[PDB]
Amino acid sequence: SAADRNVEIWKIKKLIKSLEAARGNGTSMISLIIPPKDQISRVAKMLADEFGTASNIKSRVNRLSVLGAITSVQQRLKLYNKVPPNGLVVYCGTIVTEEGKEKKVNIDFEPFKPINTSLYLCDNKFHTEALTALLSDDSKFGFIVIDGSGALFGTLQGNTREVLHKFTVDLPKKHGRAAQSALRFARLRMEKRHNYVRKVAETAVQLFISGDKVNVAGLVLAGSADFKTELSQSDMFDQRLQSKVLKLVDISYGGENGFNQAIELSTEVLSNVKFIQEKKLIGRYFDEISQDTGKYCFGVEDTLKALEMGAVEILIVYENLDIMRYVLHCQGTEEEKILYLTPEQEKDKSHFTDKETGQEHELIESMPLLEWFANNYKKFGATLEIVTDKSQEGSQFVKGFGGIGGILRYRVDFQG
Amino acid sequence: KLTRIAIVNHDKCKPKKCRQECKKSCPVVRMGKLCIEVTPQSKIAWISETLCIGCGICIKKCPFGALSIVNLPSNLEKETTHRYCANAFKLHRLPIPRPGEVLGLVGTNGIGKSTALKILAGKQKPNLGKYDWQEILTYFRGSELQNYFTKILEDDLKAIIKPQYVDQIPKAAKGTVGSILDRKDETKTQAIVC
Amino acid sequence: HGSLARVGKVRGQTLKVAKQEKKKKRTGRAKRRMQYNRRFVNVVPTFGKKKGPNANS
Amino acid sequence: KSYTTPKKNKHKRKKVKLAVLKYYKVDENGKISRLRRECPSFMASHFDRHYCGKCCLTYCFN
RNA sequence: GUCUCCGUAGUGUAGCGGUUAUCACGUUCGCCUAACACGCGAAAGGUCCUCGGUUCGAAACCGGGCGGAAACACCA
RNA sequence: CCACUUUAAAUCCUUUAACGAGGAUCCAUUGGAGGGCAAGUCUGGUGCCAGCAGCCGCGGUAAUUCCAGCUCCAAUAGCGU
RNA sequence: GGAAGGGCACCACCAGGAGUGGAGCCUGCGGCUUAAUUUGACUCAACACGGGAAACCUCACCCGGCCCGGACACGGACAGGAUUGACAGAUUGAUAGCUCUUUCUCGAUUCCGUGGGUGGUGGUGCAUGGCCGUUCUUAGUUGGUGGAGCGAUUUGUCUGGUU
RNA sequence: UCAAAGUUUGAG
Ligand SMILES: Nc1ncnc2c1ncn2[C@@H]1O[C@H](COP(=O)(O)OP(=O)(O)O)[C@@H](O)[C@H]1O
Ligand code: SF4
Ligand code: SF4
Ligand SMILES: [Mg+2]
Incomplete structure (x- = not known):
């Protein structure tokens, strides 16, 4: 299910937040990741010699x-x-926390996505750079390695390298040694060679499509022998699939060993793609500003007012805001409100006296905004789009407009 | 290599009547940066074209269209001979009067041609986009401008202007033509000119 | 590897203070006089296992 | 030191000393009439009981 | 397509119709070592590829299933 | 800053009247203070980070080595790189 | 030093004994578990050790509730009595006046700041003392004055026999 | 009058 998956992502994000905070005075903490294929014995041994070494550590509290x-x-x-x-x-590890409380902790879990990133460390802190780098990169890309010998269809995460399905074929010989039959055998060879392509082009639909929509944000075709092209530019390969043909890559080697080669020759393009889509979205946002229209918004005050109401269509946010939602509260009267404060205005601010009554209006702790959106953009209007400051349209969004806004579902006039 | 100028028509801007609008609409200003500064008091809406995006939103909003933002080549920020205010017109370079020669100025109007001519007449000090004389001359070395301006400052060169609007000479000078030529004579060559 | 992040980490967070207001210090020759006087003529005491000019127990 | 919200602190008492306390009345200037009942060993008035302020003795008329 | 053969603890393999399914490595638990390795002693672990048959009895013999691999595809 | 002098004409010095100092002022810097190498085991912050350090090194929660305050030292209309 | 000489110790061997390792249990560790299963010590030189055989106490751990045993000062606080200590009855685990309602009270205690204490089986034995243990149960160790080396050092403290 | 005996925190 989709909802259960979203809960497991939220769970892991929260786990990371705590582990990055943790810290422990003296001591070290076993960062550890055991990739799918590995033998666990292999890990047990490693640990056992890591133990024996550690017993010569000079510091006691660390040791x-x-x-x-x-x-x-x-x-x-x-x-x-x-x-x-x-x-x-x-x-x-042995994390320290408030109240001077030295506490031991041992968090193990299969992470929801496959991952292909081993790691062992002792250090003062835990290392969760791998984990964040597997929640960030959702973008699944499809690979198809055509060759005269055979095919290979496979999916691909940031690091993770899956093999969906494959086959090989006995295609005919290049030549027909009779004068007349030469021509017929050629025409026939062309028919079985094409038929193979037809089969590949169907199989790719069968694999990389799901519910009349491709599951892969690209679709890298690879191989040699002017074949990957024969697929790429055919009427047989489905147009919604062929829309997302992202590369024709000439690889040496084929099959599984062909795969990796196809990825390393693809690396540059799959980076550009994530930026290209970003440029496109913000480009539209700006179109609504460029023409009068009215269906855009910017600056928290306006944007959230648009969200609260007859909502936005798309809400665009620079992936880190500083900007943070605080929950302010009164001592005596129990009156409360919430405000979206900047890094300067949140750190120190004499504004927060209650004034009407005449007391110190205390600011109960915050929940940082981008995360606030991520929690509850669904209870509004949807499509929370994280952006960057790498593209020229990206930076103009971040620098000028404040890295916050959204494309609206209809025209709205704002005031004040 | 491309920068922005903001320009405010001091006639069409009436910050009291419109109650701001530019402040409210500008994303930089909503971002929390001093991109526009107005208030209901104080004539003429100011803009930091420094902090301006050049979104082209404030241009649409202002109810008299007082705000005109343009781009301009980054080259030209060096060679700035005159700018009268903040958010004003910005001449770049001057003509290069050479003596013994009639200098033909050409180009469409509303393009600092009068500012050039004032400067060259010497009535206007070319502020050099500051808003001085020894600092000015030093900026014009290697070029006939420095000889021109230096010549102006020690021997006061008399600046004489045939103006554009000919029909505001009538509403000023009285008497006959023949009388007026006699009064303004100095060369004593009326007959030849007539 | 390693980020270019923390950069001005310490200098930033140190506890800033003013630099007091003492005096115009004597300069040129007069300074030199005063220096000379405090090495040779003022103190010249009975010794007690070597000296110190900025020492402080 | 994250203190729980519904638990919170527990405030202690605050007394109320209501100026000079009156237990007496003036009957015909010279003589005096005491209001509240005294100890046998002011055993003061409750809503039903008659509680002492020192020797901890207790009484009531049903 | 044809004909052939092979599918057995985690891995590689023995297995002559009645077996506790053999061997090696790997695994786990002791020791030996300061530790580890090497070494020593112990232990665990086979859906005998799948289904059906024959047989008193089938891991094998016989049939069909799903896998996997060689040889052929020539004369115009 | 009047006036001479100067000078081709001036400026500058020079001479010279008249105003012209309580240091809050007419305000002296630049580098360093673990060793080489003069001079703090001082006081705050940082915690193998940031940083210093020509070399040897300092920094991993009492830093004479960092960032600061105080003092001190060297040279001084100069001193660093 | 898997270099040679000597020479020794049943925490070394040999000869043997009694064993331990096997079993059930007793108890100590480490693990897992848990609100908590407090903690120190891990080759000899940690593991029936902390004189540690914990019902409570011990106790540190956890989950609850009282209490001040917050000295002294400078002040503010001084009486329209600052504001220590209280049977009910609700609540509470509780015959905790802990809290709410109500009593009435030492009468100069108080409360609030600041300086500042004080305690703590809190952290640090890699900040220290003391005390242990171990090296290390063996025969080893030192300077004076002379002699030897620029010196670090060396000789004395030694070929041999002896113990 | 010669069998085998390899290695040793990055955590100061
Ligand atoms: N004195 C002034 N103060 C403010 N704005 C001025 C002044 N003079 C001219 N402007 C502005 O400069 C613009 C162009 O004038 P100018 O440059 O004199 O004409 P031209 O371009 O023909 O030489 C005008 O639109 C006017 O608003
Ligand atoms: S132009 Fe767009 S950006 Fe530049 S000022 Fe006017 S509004 Fe703000
Ligand atoms: S600019 Fe247009 S809008 Fe802004 S104040 Fe001047 S007039 Fe009113
Ligand atoms: Mg030095």
Whole structure:
């Protein structure tokens, strides 16, 4: 289900927030990630020698901490017997927190996406750079490696490299050694060679499409032998699929070994793509400003007022705002309100006296905005679009307009 | 290499009547930056073309169209001979009078031709886009301008102008033509000119 | 690897203070006089295991 | 030190000393009439009970 | 398409119709070591590819299934 | 700053009247203070970070080595790189 | 030093004993578990050790509730009594006056600041003392004055026999 | 009058 997946992402994001905060005085913390294919024994051994080494650590508080963590991460791994699919992510240590409370913790879990990123570390802190880099890069891209020998269809995350389906074929010989039959055999060879392409072009629809919509934001075709092109520019390959043909890549090698080659030759394009789509969206946002229209908005005050009401269509936000939603509160009267304060206005501000009554209006702690949108953009109007300051249209959005706004579902006049 | 000028027609802007509008509509100003400064008091709406995007929203909004934003080549920010105010017209370079020669100015009007001529007459000091004389001359070395302006400042060169609007000479000078030529004579060559 | 982030980390957060108001310090020759006087003529005391000009227990 | 909202603190007492306390009345200037009942060993008035302020003795008429 | 063969603990393989399914490696648990490795002692672990048949009895013999691999595709 | 002098004509010095100092002022800097190498085991912040350091090094929660305050030292209409 | 000489110790061997390792249990660790399962010590030189055989106490741990045992000062606070201590009855686990309603009270205690204390089986034995243990149960160790080396050092403290 | 015996925190 989609809702259960969104809960598991929120769970993991919250886990990361805590682990980045954690910290512990003295001590170290086992960052650890065991990729899908790995043998867990291999990990147990590694740990066991990492243990034996750590027993010569000169510092006590560090030593005994590290030994403890390694003792306990081994015990976690004992509860699994094969590596869970989609990898494993363990995070031992002895985190410190408020109240002077030294507490041990051992968070292991199969992460929801497969991942292809091993890591081991002892250091003062935990390392969750891998994990954030697997929530950021959703963008699944489809690969199809055509060759005279055979095909390979496969999907692709940031790091993760899946193999969907494949086959090979006995295509005919190049030549027909009779004078007349030469011509017929040629025409016949052309028919079976094309038929193979027809099969590939159907299979790709069968694999990379789902509910009359392609599941992959690109569709890299690869290979050699002027074949990938024969697919690329045919009437057989479905136009919604062929719309997202993103590259024809000439690879040496074929099949599985062909795959990796096809990805490394593709790397540059799949980066550009994410920026291209961003440029396109904001480009439209600006079109509504360029023409009078009315169906745009900008600056929290206006934008959220548009959201609250007959909502926006698309809401565009620069992926980090500073800007933060605070929940202000009164001591005596119990009257309360909420405000969207800038980095300067949030840090120190004499504004927040109650004035009418005459008391110090205390600001109960914040929830940072971009995250606030991410929580509850669905309870409004939808399509929360994170953007960047890399493109010229991107920067103009971030710099000028404030990296916040949205394309509206109809024309609205604003006042004050 | 492209920058922006903002221009405010001091006649068409009436900040009291319209109650702002530019302030409210400008994203930079909503962003929280001093891109426009107006108030109901104070004539003429100011803009920091520095902080301006050049969104082209304020231009649409203002109810008399007082605000005109344009672009201009980044080259030309060096060679700025005169700018009368903030958000005013901006001449770049001057003509290069050479003596013994009639200098033909050409181009469409509303393009600083009068400002050029005032400057060259010496009535106008070319502020050089500051809004001085030794600092001015030094800016015009290597070029006939420095000889021109230096010549102006020690021997006061008399600046004489045949104006554009000919029909505001009548409403000023009285008497006959023959009388007026005699009064203004100095060369003593009326008959030859007539 | 490693970010170019923290940069001015410390200098930023240090506890800023004013630099007091003492005096116009004597300059040129007069300074030199005063220096000379405090090495040789004022103190010249009974010794007690070596000296210190900016020492402080 | 994240204190829980519904738990909160617990305030202690605040007394109210209402100026000079009156327990007496003036009957014909010279003589005096006491208002509240005294101890046997002012055993003051409750809404039903007669509670002491010192020796902790307690009484009531049903 | 044809004809052929092979599908057995985690891996690679033995297996002569009645077997606790053999061997090696790997795994786990002791020791040996300061530790680890090497070493020593122990232990766990086969859906015998799938289904049906024959047989008193089938992991094998016989049939069909899903997998996997060689050889042929010549004369115009 | 009057006036001479100067000078081709001037300026500058020079001479010279008249005004012209309580240091809040007419305000002296530049570099350093662990060793080489003169001079703080001082006081705050940072916590192998930021940073310093020609070299040796300092920095991983009492830093004589960082960022600051105080003092001190060298040279001084100059001193660094 | 898987270099040679000597020479020694049942925390070394040999000869043997009694064993431990096997079993059930007792108890200590580490793990897992848990509100909490407090913590120190991990080769000899941690693990029936902390004189640690915890019902409570111990106790640190956790989940609840009282209490001040907040000295002294400078002040503000001084009496239209600052504002220590209270049977009900509700509540509470509780015969905690802990709280709400109501009593009435020492009468000069108080409360609020600041300076500042004080305590803490809180953190740090890698900031220290003391005390242990271990090196290390062996025969080893030192300067004076002379001699030897620019010196670091060396000789004395030694070939041999002896113990 | 010679079998085998490889390695050693990045965590100061
Ligand atoms: N004194 C002034 N103060 C403010 N604005 C001026 C002044 N003189 C001219 N302008 C502005 O400059 C613009 C162009 O004038 P100008 O340059 O004199 O004409 P031209 O371009 O023909 O030489 C006018 O629109 C006017 O608003
Ligand atoms: S132009 Fe667009 S941006 Fe530049 S000022 Fe007027 S409004 Fe603000
Ligand atoms: S600019 Fe147009 S709008 Fe802004 S004040 Fe002057 S007139 Fe009113
Ligand atoms: Mg030095």
